[PDB]
């Protein structure tokens, strides 16, 4: 919580539009499946999609998936608060905090997700699974678990800006 409304300009990058076929009586009923993640360009970057009959249909159900969910990703100016090895679903992600002009060095689903979700310098090299859905899953859990310093002082009551460096 809270579920952020679709109230901004979405990026709508496509992660990958995979084939799929249910092996039924008569061959294989082929249906496209695409998990393409929409991005707000400020921090609302959510990545889920569905299936449909045509390639544009998978674009439509994917965009409906982007209007489903969104994440926060609090990070003070080309970084995250604590560079935590965040992966959930058998596919890791090792995203550290990088400097200002160190670029968004990430992979396929990491470079799509962080590349369309407001990243400036966050070094990322995975360790684990390589499915698309597993990449957006563990990357979404890792981006949805990294803590912000002001709120981290505001919820653990020691002092705000008492942990600096």
């Amino acid at each position: 919580r809270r579920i952020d409304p679709s109230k901004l300009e979405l990026e709508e990058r496509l992660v990958t539009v995979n084939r799929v076929a249910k092996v039924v009586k008569g061959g294989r009923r082929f249906r496209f499946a695409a998990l393409v993640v929409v991005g707000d360009k400020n921090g609302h970057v959510g990545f889920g999609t569905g299936k449909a009959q045509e390639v544009p249909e998978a674009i439509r159900k994917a965009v409906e998936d982007a209007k489903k969910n969104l994440i926060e990703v609090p990070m003070v100016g080309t970084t995250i608060p604590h560079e935590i090895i965040g992966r959930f679903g058998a596919g890791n992600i090792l995203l550290k905090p990088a400097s200002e002009g160190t670029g968004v060095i990430a992979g396929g689903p990491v470079r799509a997700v962080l590349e369309l979700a407001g990243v400036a310098d966050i070094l990322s090299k995975s360790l684990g699974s390589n499915t698309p859905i597993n990449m957006i899953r563990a990357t979404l859990q890792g981006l949805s678990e990294l803590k912000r310093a002001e709120d981290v002082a505001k919820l653990r009551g020691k002092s705000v800006e008492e942990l600096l460096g």
């Binding site: 310093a149 653990r156 942990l163 460096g165």
Partner: protein, 131 residues
């Protein structure tokens, strides 16, 4: 049993740290004592009140984590393994977390914190690490 005491306390604050319990027990020792004053003074738990008695023990701390899931004890890790010991020099005393957490290196003048131990500028046995 009794492989390591500090790992028993850290497993206590961890398992109770996810259980959502109000108070937490412990085995009362000088590491639970000085680590209770350090980890209580840094503002994770509400209060440690070491209710001592015969024969040994026994500390009793309360989880100072409010409504928001995961309070000031948000995750702990054995940075020093009793069995294969960590080490950290002056310049190599690593501050765990980066900006959120804090590590507790057992310095040569008392069980310090991360930033205070870097303030003394002398490291020692990496006592525990609270990410």
């Amino acid at each position: 049993v009794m492989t390591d005491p500090i790992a028993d306390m850290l497993t206590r604050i961890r398992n109770a740290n996810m259980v959502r319990h109000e108070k937490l027990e412990i085995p009362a020792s000088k590491l639970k004592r000085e680590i209770a004053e350090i980890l209580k003074r840094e503002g994770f738990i509400r209060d440690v009140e070491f209710v001592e008695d015969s024969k040994q023990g026994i500390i009793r701390v309360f989880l100072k984590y409010g409504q928001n899931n995961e309070r000031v004890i948000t995750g702990l890790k054995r940075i020093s393994k009793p069995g294969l010991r960590v080490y950290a020099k002056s310049n190599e005393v690593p501050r765990v977390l980066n900006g959120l957490g804090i590590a507790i290196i057992s310095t040569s003048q008392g069980v310090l914190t991360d930033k205070e131990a870097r303030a003394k500028q002398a490291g020692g046995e990496v006592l525990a690490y609270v990410w």
